[PDB]
Amino acid sequence: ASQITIQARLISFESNRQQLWKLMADLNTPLINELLCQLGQHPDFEKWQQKGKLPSTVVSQLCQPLKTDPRFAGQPSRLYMSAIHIVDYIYKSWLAIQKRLQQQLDGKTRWLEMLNSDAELVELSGDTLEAIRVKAAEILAILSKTLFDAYQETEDIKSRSAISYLLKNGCKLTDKEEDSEKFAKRRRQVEIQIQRLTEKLSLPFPLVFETNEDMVWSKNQKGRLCVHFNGLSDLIFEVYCGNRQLHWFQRFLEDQQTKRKSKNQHSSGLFTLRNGHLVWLEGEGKGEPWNLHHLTLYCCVDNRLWTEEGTEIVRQEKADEITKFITNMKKKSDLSDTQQALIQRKQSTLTRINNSFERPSQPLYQGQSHILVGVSLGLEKPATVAVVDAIANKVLAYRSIKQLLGDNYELLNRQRRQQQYLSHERHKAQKNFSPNQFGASELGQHIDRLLAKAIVALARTYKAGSIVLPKLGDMREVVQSEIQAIAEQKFPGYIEGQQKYAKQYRVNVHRWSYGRLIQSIQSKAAQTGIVIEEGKQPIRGSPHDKAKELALSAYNLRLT
Amino acid sequence: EMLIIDEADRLKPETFADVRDIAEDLGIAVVLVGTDRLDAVIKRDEQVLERFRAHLRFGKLSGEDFKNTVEMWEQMVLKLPVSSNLKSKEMLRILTSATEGYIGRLDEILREAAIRSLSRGLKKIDKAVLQEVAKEYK
RNA sequence: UAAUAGCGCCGCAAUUCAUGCUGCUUGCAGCCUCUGAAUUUUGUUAAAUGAGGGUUAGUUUGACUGUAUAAAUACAGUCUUGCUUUCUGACCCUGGUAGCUGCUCACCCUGAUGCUGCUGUCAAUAGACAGGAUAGGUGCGCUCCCAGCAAUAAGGGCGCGGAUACUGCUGUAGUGGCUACUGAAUCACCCCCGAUCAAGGGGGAACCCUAAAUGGGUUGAAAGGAGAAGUCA
Numbered sequence: 032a033s034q035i036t037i038q039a040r041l042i043s044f045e046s047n048r049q050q051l052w053k054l055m056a057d058l059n060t061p062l063i064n065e066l067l068c069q070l071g072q073h074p075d076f077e078k079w080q081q082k083g084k085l086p087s088t089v090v091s092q093l094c095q096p097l098k099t100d101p102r103f104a105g106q107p108s109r110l111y112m113s114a115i116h117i118v119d120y121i122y123k124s125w126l127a128i129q130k131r132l133q134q135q136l137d138g139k140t141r142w143l144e145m146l147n148s149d150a151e152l153v154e155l156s157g158d159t160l161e162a163i164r165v166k167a168a169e170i171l172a173i174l175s176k177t178l179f180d181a182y183q184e185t186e187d188i189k190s191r192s193a194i195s196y197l198l199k200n201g202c203k204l205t206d207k208e209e210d211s212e213k214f215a216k217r218r219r220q221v222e223i224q225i226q227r228l229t230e231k232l233s234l235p236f237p238l239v240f241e242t243n244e245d246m247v248w249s250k251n252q253k254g255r256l257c258v259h260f261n262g263l264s265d266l267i268f269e270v271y272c273g274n275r276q277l278h279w280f281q282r283f284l285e286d287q288q289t290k291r292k293s294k295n296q297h298s299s300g301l302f303t304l305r306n307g308h309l310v311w312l313e314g315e316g317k318g319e320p321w322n323l324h325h326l327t328l329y330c331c332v333d334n335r336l337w338t339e340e341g342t343e344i345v346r347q348e349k350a351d352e353i354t355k356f357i358t359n360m361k362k363k364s365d366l367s368d369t370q371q372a373l374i375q376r377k378q379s380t381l382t383r384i385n386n387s388f389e390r391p392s393q394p395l396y397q398g399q400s401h402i403l404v405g406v407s408l409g410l411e412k413p414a415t416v417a418v419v420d421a422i423a424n425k426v427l428a429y430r431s432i433k434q435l436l437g438d439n440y441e442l443l444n445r446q447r448r449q450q451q452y453l454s455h456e457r458h459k460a461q462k463n464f465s466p467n468q469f470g471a472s473e474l475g476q477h478i479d480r481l482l483a484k485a486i487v488a489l490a491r492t493y494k495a496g497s498i499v500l501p502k503l504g505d506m507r508e509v510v511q512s513e514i515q516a517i518a519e520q521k522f523p524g525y526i527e528g529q530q531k532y533a534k535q536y537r538v539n540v541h542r543w544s545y546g547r548l549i550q551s552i553q554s555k556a557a558q559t560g561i562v563i564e565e566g567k568q569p570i571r572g573s574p575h576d577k578a579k580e581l582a583l584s585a586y587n588l589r590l591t
Numbered sequence: 592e593m594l595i596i597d598e599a600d601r602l603k604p605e606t607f608a609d610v611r612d613i614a615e616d617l618g619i620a621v622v623l624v625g626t627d628r629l630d631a632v633i634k635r636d637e638q639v640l641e642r643f644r645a646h647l648r649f650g651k652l653s654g655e656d657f658k659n660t661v662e663m664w665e666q667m668v669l670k671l672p673v674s675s676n677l678k679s680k681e682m683l684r685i686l687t688s689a690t691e692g693y694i695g696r697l698d699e700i701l702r703e704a705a706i707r708s709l710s711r712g713l714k715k716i717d718k719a720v721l722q723e724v725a726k727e728y729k
Numbered sequence: 730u731a732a733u734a735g736c737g738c739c740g741c742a743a744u745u746c747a748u749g750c751u752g753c754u755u756g757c758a759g760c761c762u763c764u765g766a767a768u769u770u771u772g773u774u775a776a777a778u779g780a781g782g783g784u785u786a787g788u789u790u791g792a793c794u795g796u797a798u799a800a801a802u803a804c805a806g807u808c809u810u811g812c813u814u815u816c817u818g819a820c821c822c823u824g825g826u827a828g829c830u831g832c833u834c835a836c837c838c839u840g841a842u843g844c845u846g847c848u849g850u851c852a853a854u855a856g857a858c859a860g861g862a863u864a865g866g867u868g869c870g871c872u873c874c875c876a877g878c879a880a881u882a883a884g885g886g887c888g889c890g891g892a893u894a895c896u897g898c899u900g901u902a903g904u905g906g907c908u909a910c911u912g913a914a915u916c917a918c919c920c921c922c923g924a925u926c927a928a929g930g931g932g933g934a935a936c937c938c939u940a941a942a943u944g945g946g947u948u949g950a951a952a953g954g955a956g957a958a959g960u961c962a
């Protein structure tokens with residue numbers, strides 16, 4: 032899985048864009064709005080929230096009686112299926128948050144009604160917690176996924192209270208056979224949250240085209256690349272890309288022509304194009320929306336398919352997941368009419384997958400993960416690295432933040448200054464204020480990408496097999512402890528001065544964005560081929576020592 | 592003439608005043624011994640930190656000098672009929688691996704291995720019992 | 730006149746070290762000469778930082794094939810489109826006229842993450858006019874500090890009216906926001922005519938090659954994953 036997206040503006044006639052704006056802003060988004068509302072008031076909605084799996088076909092079923100509606104008609108099949116898909120996945124994320132809120136409220140009402148304190152536990156249930164806690168401990172600690180699911184399932188007052196007590200007490204050899212505070216705070220926090228939940232119980236949507244061939248490519252008489260989409264072939268758009276992204280688009284036309292010249296003996300499905308959104312960006316100025324906003328294509332390209340050697344890897348992934356799909360469907364005896372069509376399409380792909388298109392030749396680097404580049408995140412130094420051997424105990428080479436961001440350091444300093452300025456402005460914004468993006472930029476993202484590129488390049492230089500990153504959850508405790516450590520480093524025991532310096536430090540050296548950095552490193556390493564493991568950053572020590580010990584802890588846990 | 596307060600990170604901040612007083616009036620060299628925690632303990636002190644500023648860090652002892660110490664423990668403290676052990680690079684790797692240079696651990700490990708070997712009848716110390724104590728520390 | 734102090738940065742040291750340097754002794758010995766790391770420690774007649782607002786489908790970071798090359802990388806060949814960004818420059822500016830609106834003010838007192846704070850010129854009024862990013866303070870900034878103002882922090886006091894949730898003492902008066910039209914730059918060696926849902930076309934200069942031929946070249950660089958939704962603050 033190395034999916035990446037390229038983009039290119041689409042230029043066409045005004046009449047060619049008035050059709051696309053009206054078709055989408057007036058008919059396709061309202062279909063998504065109505066499909067979202069209907070999926071919410073569906074009777075089975077609370078059944079879905081209990082699970083994480085909205086049914087495969089439900090969003091489609093609510094759309095078939097909606098395609099013929101007076102206000103949702105005239106949409107191309109791809110436009111309709113895109114809207115359905117939009118409702119499934121846009122409303123997917125929507126109802127995911129929905130069942131978080133709705134089902135959390137339901138559980139809080141329920142836990143409030145059932146879970147109780149130690150005193151009420153003794154009064155109603157009255158079971159000795161040590162005995163049942165130790166029994167459950169010897170049941171689970173002595174595939175524990177089944178046991179954790181069982182804990183997730185047990186809801187009776189005594190059973191849920193005792194199993195949660197065992198889970199939160201350490202579920203292990205703890206000499207303190209105490210702390211009814213576990214389910215006490217459980218019920219208390221539940222009551223507070225149920226109180227809260229009792230009190231509180233201009234751009235159209237994109238066009239996801241899940242089929243690669245729904246975009247048909249052609250070369251203009253001037254040599255420019257052109258696109259027209261399935262369902263709208265009278266609408267022709269010209270690809271205004273950049274030369275860096277051009278070799279993808281020339282690959283699209285070449286790949287499509289190659290399938291044509293073989294009389295569809297080639298499997299679109301090894302295409303370097305997987306799908307493509309068709310969004311409208313936002314323009315500055317005035318005017319009818321089609322003349323202001325720039326239509327933009329967002330093609331998702333599996334970068335692994337570019338090389339011929341990489342294609343065989345994809346050729347092996349699909350030929351394995353699909354031959355399993357066949358066997359999974361071959362055990363059933365239902366033998367539906369259109370089901371056998373689906374069965375038919377599968378063996379068609381297997382036969383069509385062994386016909387190779389011309390792709391470049393690359394000896395994909397083989398990575399031995401024994402080397403462990405360890406990356407340490409903090410406040411004073413935003414990020415430091417340590418290339419350390421694990422079989423030995425020597426550090427091959429450290430690099431600090433001033434040394435990974437070559438010529439990008441002034442960027443870090445001015446980004447810290449900007450993050451100070453923007454935070455002061457947001458605090459000054461109070462509750463009533465104009466939009467707070469005034470003066471904001473994506474300098475933080477540029478730095479979080481420059482840093483990931485350098486870290487991965489350093490890993491590749493030393494043949495590193497893995498890059499180790501701190502768990503993002505432990506990034507508030509770590510920064511708080513680093514502030515404390517700096518405080519006692521400056522003021523030894525003068526507590527007043529320590530607090531004052533902590534305040535003044537938080538004023539200037541703001542918290543970094545340790546989510547975009549971990550995500551950008553995950554993207555870059557995955558693109559290059561370096562697997563990423565996660566360890567536990569040590570609480571104290573010098574940043575270089577913290578990085579080295581993180582890297583070693585990662586290997587120690589890998590040994591398990 | 593000299594008052595050596597060992598483990599001087601224990602006493603409360605309100606008695607550093609009295610040790611200051613002693614050193615202040617009697618002209619007595621007060622030597623506070625303690626783990627590094629003692630330094631932070633006096634760091635909070637405003638004069639204790641100023642008054643007690645000459646210091647002498649204990650060496651970790653690692654290196655050739657550690658190799659000497661190892662053999663020095665064989666003859667001086669272990670007191671066994673000579674077994675021609677001589678703490679060879681193998682036993683030295685084990686002990687550098689295990690003790691990390693701390694004299695305590697050098698002593699704890701060697702005494703345990705000697706006691707074990709003599710309890711099981713072994714006249715000298717085998718590599719087996721050395722691996723035993725090594726694993727049972729780390 | 731004053732900006733003390735604090736806090737963050739940035740050098741500059743100084744020391745200790747290796748991820749260095751050096752040496753083979755090949756994992757030890759030195760060394761700090763570069764490169765870093767880690768302290769602390771100054772703010773040099775200075776080193777490096779450096780935050781008023783804007784302007785380019787700017788340039789550079791590119792693809793394929795071949796060669797050298799294990800690779801990188803180099804070189805040659807062929808192609809080239811303008812996306813979204815981060816810088817570095819260069820340049821422009823310190824906006825106007827119209828409307829529509831928001832807030833805040835009887836009067837005190839403290840003083841906020843409050844506002845203001847440039848150079849001349851003419852006043853010395855409170856404003857013009859010229860300049861203009863060097864812009865109160867420190868090497869450089871700050872919510873810190875200084876100076877004025879402070880009704881537009883919050884709190885306290887407290888007069889008269891009307892009401893008996895709260896009002897009035899309030900002038901565009903002061904500061905905001907919005908829209909519409911306008912002012913300048915509209916760039917990447919420079920200049921001119923143009924495109925800007927598309928368009929480039931010309932004309933110079935320096936330099937290099939070349940004696941010399943708009944003969945050719947060259948006249949800053951980098952990075953990519955985008956959309957949607959929800960939650961927290």
Ligand SMILES: Nc1ncnc2c1ncn2[C@@H]1O[C@H](COP(=O)(O)OP(=O)(O)OP(=O)(O)O)[C@@H](O)[C@H]1O
Pocket residue numbers: 598625626693694695696698699
């Ligand atoms: N001169 C010596 N001869 C023999 N054994 C010694 C000697 N010095 C230290 N040791 C041993 O080394 C270990 C160190 O223990 P010791 O109590 O001296 O540690 P410490 O560092 O003083 O402890 P703390 O920090 O608690 O004061 C013990 O096993 C001790 O017997």
